[PDB]
């Protein structure tokens, strides 16, 4: 939440999930941001369960 406006106001590139940044681009009332892609497909994300 601080990284919303501090990246808006201040040259701060952030370290986070891209899909969140996709939605943060989806929320800003002006198209006023920039993202750069990432491709690391050897490691994945699964969903935990009962052992």
């Amino acid at each position: 939440s601080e990284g919303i406006r501090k990246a808006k106001k201040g040259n701060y590139a952030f370290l986070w999930d891209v899909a969140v940044v996709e939605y943060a681009a989806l929320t800003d009332d002006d198209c006023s941001v920039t993202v750069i892609g990432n491709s690391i497909s050897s490691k994945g994300y699964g969903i935990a369960l009962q052992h």
Copy 2:
């Protein structure tokens, strides 16, 4: 095993696994290798166990 030097000595944009190319251009010694990038998240490989 067929279209090997036809991609290197002919107009054939041959199409296979990138890691196989990291073996094949390693077998190549003539510096006639060029390739572009690709990000495909859906498919891949991990060793099967017993059921």
